[model samples]
Target: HGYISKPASRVYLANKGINVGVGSAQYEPQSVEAPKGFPISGPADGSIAGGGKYSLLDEQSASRWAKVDIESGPLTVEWTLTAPHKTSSWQYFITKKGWDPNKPLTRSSLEPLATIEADGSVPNALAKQEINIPNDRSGYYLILGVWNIADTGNAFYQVIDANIIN
Candidate 1:
């Protein structure tokens, strides 16, 4: 599927009545609300890193991202941005190979399953998306990021989703 969903950071699966089933969801203990699953990979816990500074002039910046092996079965991951509080020239950010502002990104290698747009009216909240893995694959790399839509700043983080049962 070469189709891209307009580059918005978040995609609503169940919200659109496109249910992927209850068993597909994985949960974290701290999050009060559980998120739905996507690109269903294997079982694993999504990881994160924070506490970085951004220049005020950098409109779009990479906040965070996750890197995962899509080959893992029944796995779902999400990345959150808690800084900047403003949209710049870029809309969203991503990094499949971990956090590095100087490098270019790829969907095939990074396996970016989804993203949310910067100006989306979602308020400060977690945006959820799903990546459905094929039964033939076992793992893929993933990264998370945030972009400045109105400007040209970017930020990103990475994680590993292992053991997908494709």
Candidate 2:
């Protein structure tokens, strides 16, 4: 699943947990930026978004998010995010290819089921978004990524569970 987050945001997952790795896109999501080495070990004042495995952090809180390949069945995603102070053409969503500025991913082209924005706010002071993704015929990939045009932030994801209906 795709996880998106900004600084001082809340992240929750279905099952898998987050490790809070360094801000190196390689280990954790690009949104999460760490000045020092990753694996942040500290106290999060419930203000941080996270649940399940994505919630618990090991000594090395560097793994900012948890990821698992989906198998089948229904799934749910939840998160609380803060909008960056600045973002013009910056993308709020994209495929696993990541938030590429030059190349963007279209939900319609990639077989997007739906897209909805928050009712009153753009950043959504504390919004809880959820979606149910059906299993693809041949098993396609579903990715969620967010990026800032000016600064860095936090982002992560969790796979609710995988149960093949067939």
Candidate 3:
């Protein structure tokens, strides 16, 4: 048997009443107190079969979204890995510049923004990387992060709903 959950992802998953992979849930869009969907609600096999085509956006856009505020370019994204695995890299993607939050998210709605690679080890390391936002952009956007583990065939995905302030 094999199982793994990152600290950030663990908290998000626990609040959703999801563990590893097993559960049924009603889509609730009005609640802002929890993470909407993680691996359990999506493809639960820990397999994102398609490369970049996997759609991270699951719930109806009209439903409530977790919101984060950003003032300008160069936002800091921090990852705290506890007793970390051999890391390959971290990738960040954001919805394309004029994406409509009202519609469901698709791979076409996003563009790869950044990637940070790591060496063979970084146990219990606090990692921080900066993602730059376009200056002309203003609105709500979904930010997705992927932590690719070197030794395993699986990766962890984290979605963040953000509102950019001009």
Candidate 4:
């Protein structure tokens, strides 16, 4: 349905010429939908950022992309949507402490950061949600945002590169 716009996501960076070597995500940032069955049946590891629809994002490394400067605690993540649909919910995840950034993202490398319970919520072209960043975390992190649709077989995925300062 949409992609993260504010905070400058990886795909957002790619479109802005801030991050190089990209796939169609830079061109079609709002279309990165893959199977919603993550952790078991969704896009495979190394492809979560692109949802297997944009493979260049599967290329991973600590220095591969530009990062958003963020602070720990409450933060607003904004979306630029193509079309709004009935939503199941929105979920956010982050890399664990000491997690290696020099490797592809995996189900094992991430942990839920926050979730907005919106089972069949109103549709909006612009979605903004506040999620609390771990007050204990500092430095670089890979953030994953999943837009779960209430009546679809897939979910839109976006990854954000962030440098956090407490």
TM-score of 3: 0.64
Ten contiguous residues minimizing lDDT sum, candidate 3:
25-34
List, residue by residue over 1-166, the lDDT tens digit for candidate 1: 0001112111122112332221212121111111112223211222121102111111122322221224533334443433333442111222343433333333322444444444523223243344444454433322333332233222232222232334
Task: Please tell me which model should have the higher TM-score, number 2 or number 3.
Answer: 3
- Candidate 3 residue pairs in backbone clash: 29-64
All candidates' TM-scores? 0.32, 0.33, 0.64, 0.95
Q: Across residues 48-103, which tens digit of lDDT does each residue of candidate 2 receive?
A: 22211233321212122344454344434333344423321212221232222222
- The reply for model 3, stretches above 4 Å from the true place, is 1-57
Best by lDDT: 4
Note the Cα lDDT for every prediction shown.
0.27, 0.29, 0.51, 0.85
Give the poorly placed runs of model 1, Cα more than 4 Å off. 1-76, 84-112, 115-123, 139-152
Better of 1 and 4 by TM-score: 4
Give the Å error, residue 109, model 2: 6.8
RMSDs, each prediction?
Answer: 14.6, 12.3, 8.5, 1.2
Q: After superposition, how far is residue 17 of candidate 1 from its true place, in Å?
A: 38
